[PDB]
């Protein structure tokens, strides 16, 4: 029985980080306790001041990544302060029954509720508010013994990074400029019309064109293995590490399945999270992007990863530098 | 030789049902005989009276699902009554040679023809009229010994359901309202222009926004295993069972391949059929949908499954009901 | 060490052909030397004279396919004559570090450079100019022992064919006709606006609506096994052999992974190359196409394969020819 089990309380962190956690664990089924605070707000989403009338779990797009193990129970306290304007809920793709929890978690402003479900299937899993993919994140459910390659050999990551990718549908006034709305409710009707064209005005990693560039680049060092968790609650995307690979990729994001190796580009189905391991072998700046290069370069779906360490001439070498043609 | 074999005659049924059939079978290679009647007609496809100038196999979108076993031969009598206006044919993705049969089956109004081909590859397979994905269905070819999991362990379904998903491209007049055409031939030119924008006006399960909702919901009981066969002859879709999973999914729909487990969302390539098993564990209403939530909610790609049985507190429990914040 | 190894010089050929090469090889790690000449030019891309302001490796879309083995080193001399107008580079998805080589290969008109990298991961891999998917091709890296099926059984192809698929975004003037630009630089601004709609004006195999039809059809004979290499540096496509199958398909295009069998339609992620084997069993004309039939028929993503040999009545037979209804 679940009630008769130990309870742990987890402190969540902002994306792109994932809270500290154990991979392989001698430990036993726990009930893991999480709390999240829904937050409506306006956000600047590009370099030119365009705003989005947003809804978030915990203030961030994406919401934070919750981590448990196969067999653990997730118990989430979902809070929706009075400072907000709408009901909300949460649908956990990792959970079974009641529209993934959506039905047991409808909370008006100033309300709260608490859900428990068995996390009995390993993998990365999207949770989102039932009709809003803008409010989403990843539930990572690790197998009790850690990640395994197709032959059962152990696998691991030294650091985890979390990337939620968002297709945005921002309306334009008669002048051709993006509309700014005073409330969430007023954005609604125009946004739907733009959504019906199926053409995003913007596709952003982590809230904003550039969220994962400049001072905000991800980081690693040569010899380090990194887990890239990629979620997209609404639209297909195709992650690619420029100059890298996915050493082992669960593109459908479910750990009881063997991963694929050596991927150049993988595929995240809209309504899901997937996961890729890469061990760095060269230093420098990498681009992690959506390999529709229009969606990446023109619309916003690209980030960087600054990698420290020693250059390897065996893997790659500049034989003749750029020079005039003989 | 095929001629020297026993012949069976199968009675087809309307979607979402699949005609009664054997899974694992001690039986031997049969020649299975099917007949289909092509039918052009106008259809109401949404809640507001929008019509589509349609073509169907057997009166329904999708056409009925034909079921055989690996090694069986499909022999189809394709009929096109005089009451119709165009030639038609059938391309079976399950068949080898002659454009999947398209070349041996061109039938003008008042004509008919009969095709046989070896069904020598297991899987769910799309058949459609050569230039019209609107006229399509699934050929399920079962392995002679039934469905197998990745380790060879036997698998099964207690009931099969069939979902054909259709991207529709309905033209608008200068006033902004959907055009109504008196014939199939007059819809053609405007529809092509809208098709060239690659933006469906509608994406429907089984003919109509709502075909699989209300009184028409699919049905199951807790402890039952259901096969969800999903076909899309023209455009990519991404099925998801809200509150459920795909326990075992052949997303490319070919049974000699190991299935994947625990999928939250799977992917059907345009021009194919895939297949998912789910064993229910909770009662209530589920939504089976295209997890581009614009395509589902705004455009029409969503259905329901009403599930009877006993609630399970272990899997999911409401710990604190929605209540004011302390 | 790489410098201490034998060097081979390979002569490249125009698509759809792939230069002669060994599959399984008793031979040892070589350093393979390739040279490519970048070429800007205007091209006619459809039947009605529409032009594209193009950039190519070696004069062709796609660029030629480079073939090596796992363990070999690729050393490419990249040349950009003075007759051109822009810098260019190359990003090899098969390579590790320095943005796949892009950083070590920026070459202005009249410059050249030479890159070496270890090809240490088997598979088909896209190489392209960093911001232009129009300039792309495939690096096929074969496993040293040849293609293997999921059980380790040997596989082979008798001939290889190469298909690069290109989504084109051609601007229209106020009259509704495609714009013709005098330089590459003048096409830029209008093209970007059209790209931002994410709606190709054209999707072409190998440079041109029809490049792989009529006298230019691919060819085979019954009993022959063919490798279809399919690359798409920018957008998702879904190859399908009408009347055929993918006997063994590495849709993510990476050979250390087991292939899937019996596929009706496969999926190439934008930013990747995949690969399918088919052994012909029937003669006639086949269509190899993108199974979004709008993208194929209306936009240009379809080709033919003329197959010689003996008709097989076991696989497929016309039982009753088209005839009046009794
Ligand atoms: Zn909400
Ligand atoms: Zn490590
Ligand atoms: Zn969902
Ligand atoms: Zn037809
Ligand atoms: Zn059962
Ligand atoms: Zn087809
Ligand atoms: Zn370039
Ligand atoms: Zn051969
Ligand atoms: Zn690339």
């Amino acid at each position: 029985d679940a009630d008769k089990l130990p309870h742990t309380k987890v402190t969540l962190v902002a994306p792109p980080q994932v809270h500290p956690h154990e991979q392989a664990t001698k430990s036993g089924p726990k009930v893991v306790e999480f709390t999240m605070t829904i937050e409506e707000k306006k956000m600047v989403i590009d370099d030119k001041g365009t705003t989005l009338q947003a809804m978030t779990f915990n203030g961030s797009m994406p919401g934070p990544t919750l981590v448990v193990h196969e067999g653990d129970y997730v118990q989430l306290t979902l809070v929706n302060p009075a400072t907000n304007a709408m009901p909300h809920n949460v649908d956990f793709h990792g959970a079974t029954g009641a529209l993934g929890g959506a039905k047991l978690t409808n909370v008006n402003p100033g309300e709260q509720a608490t859900l428990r479900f068995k996390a009995d299937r390993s993998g990365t899993f999207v949770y989102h508010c039932t009709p809003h993919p803008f409010m989403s994140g990843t539930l990572m459910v690790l197998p009790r013994d850690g990640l395994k390659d197709p032959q059962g050999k152990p696998l691991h990551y030294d650091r985890a990074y979390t990337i939620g990718e968002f297709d945005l549908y921002i309306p334009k006034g008669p002048d051709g400029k993006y509309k700014d709305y005073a409330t969430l409710a007023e954005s609604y009707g125009d946004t739907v019309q733009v959504m019906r064209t199926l053409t995003p005005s913007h596709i952003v990693f982590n809230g904003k064109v550039g969220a994962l560039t400049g001072a905000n680049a991800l980081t690693a060092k040569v010899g380090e293995t990194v887990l890239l968790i990629h979620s997209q609650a609404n639209r297909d995307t195709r992650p690619h590490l420029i100059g890298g690979h996915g050493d082992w990729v669960w593109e459908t994001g479910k750990f009881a399945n063997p991963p694929q190796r050596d991927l150049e580009t993988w595929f995240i189905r809209g309504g899901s999270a997937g996961a890729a391991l890469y061990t760095f072998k060269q230093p420098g700046v990498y681009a992690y992007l959506n390999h529709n290069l229009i969606e990446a370069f023109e619309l916003g779906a690209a980030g960087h990863i600054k990698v420290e360490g020693k250059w390897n001439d065996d893997l790659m070498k500049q034989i003749k530098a750029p020079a005039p043609i003989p």
Side-chain angles (χ1 to χ4, degrees), chain A residues 1-3 5-25 27-29 31-152 154-176 178-192 194-220 222-280 282-305 307 309 311-319 321-326:
Chain A
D1 179 282
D3 299 291
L5 280 155
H7 288 217
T8 325
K9 294 172 220 264
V10 181
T11 286
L12 297 162
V13 295
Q17 333 284 343
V18 187
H19 73 257
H21 54 279
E22 275 199 291
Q23 281 164 62
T25 188
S27 172
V31 165
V32 195
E33 275 172 36
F34 288 103
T35 184
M36 271 187 310
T37 310
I38 302 164
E39 211 230 307
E40 299 168 10
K41 58 182 194 155
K42 202 192 287 212
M43 290 179 77
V44 174
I45 51 77
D46 63 12
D47 302 320
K48 67 189 173 297
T50 309
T51 71
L52 162 79
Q53 279 292 5
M55 305 140 263
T56 71
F57 290 104
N58 271 7
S60 65
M61 276 173 70
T65 298
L66 289 67
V67 189
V68 300
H69 297 81
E70 185 185 6
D72 297 345
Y73 292 74
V74 174
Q75 189 169 305
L76 164 83
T77 290
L78 179 67
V79 178
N80 184 10
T83 21
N84 286 330
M86 292 175 65
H88 296 307
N89 53 2
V90 60
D91 173 359
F92 273 93
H93 286 183
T96 312
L99 312 174
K103 268 161 78 61
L104 308 184
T105 49
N106 302 266
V107 286
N108 303 132
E111 258 163 50
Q112 66 167 71
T114 305
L115 176 75
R116 192 187 70 209
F117 60 89
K118 197 171 190 171
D120 59 358
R121 298 158 183 270
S122 78
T124 58
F125 283 99
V126 155
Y127 68 78
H128 59 89
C129 178
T130 268
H132 313 114
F134 285 22
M135 267 170 83
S136 62
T138 305
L139 171 72
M140 185 159 65
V141 185
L142 290 161
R144 203 155 280 288
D145 201 15
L147 270 9
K148 297 277 169 274
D149 88 352
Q151 281 66 44
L155 291 172
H156 78 275
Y157 50 93
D158 296 304
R159 84 211 349 293
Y161 278 124
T162 201
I163 302 99
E165 180 177 339
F166 298 93
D167 46 316
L168 303 183
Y169 296 89
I170 315 184
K172 274 160 171 180
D175 56 4
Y178 295 106
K179 285 201 160 192
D180 207 277
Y181 305 90
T183 67
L184 192 34
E186 294 155 294
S187 58
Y188 180 83
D190 298 334
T191 294
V192 169
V194 182
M195 283 170 38
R196 298 183 77 92
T197 72
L198 306 173
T199 305
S201 56
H202 302 263
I203 318 169
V204 302
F205 287 178
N206 292 29
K208 180 155 162 166
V209 177
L212 293 196
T213 55
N216 278 321
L218 319 171
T219 64
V222 166
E224 217 175 357
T225 293
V226 191
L227 183 80
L228 300 169
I229 299 158
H230 201 110
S231 76
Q232 227 297 194
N234 193 70
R235 193 185 151 94
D236 305 321
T237 182
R238 49 206 70 66
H240 169 83
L241 184 55
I242 309 210
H245 289 86
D247 283 339
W248 295 108
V249 181
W250 294 258
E251 79 169 27
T252 52
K254 310 301 166 276
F255 302 144
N257 303 298
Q260 282 201 142
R261 53 175 292 144
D262 309 313
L263 304 195
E264 66 188 305
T265 303
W266 42 111
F267 194 61
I268 301 318
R269 294 136 190 75
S272 79
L277 291 164
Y278 190 60
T279 304
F280 291 90
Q282 303 274 42
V285 176
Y286 294 71
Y288 178 64
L289 50 71
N290 175 336
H291 214 297
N292 181 304
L293 297 170
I294 306 161
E295 305 188 349
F297 297 138
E298 290 300 311
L299 309 182
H304 299 141
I305 306 192
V307 173
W311 187 259
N312 183 331
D313 263 357
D314 181 54
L315 297 178
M316 184 177 284
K317 189 183 180 169
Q318 187 177 59
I319 300 285
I325 302 167

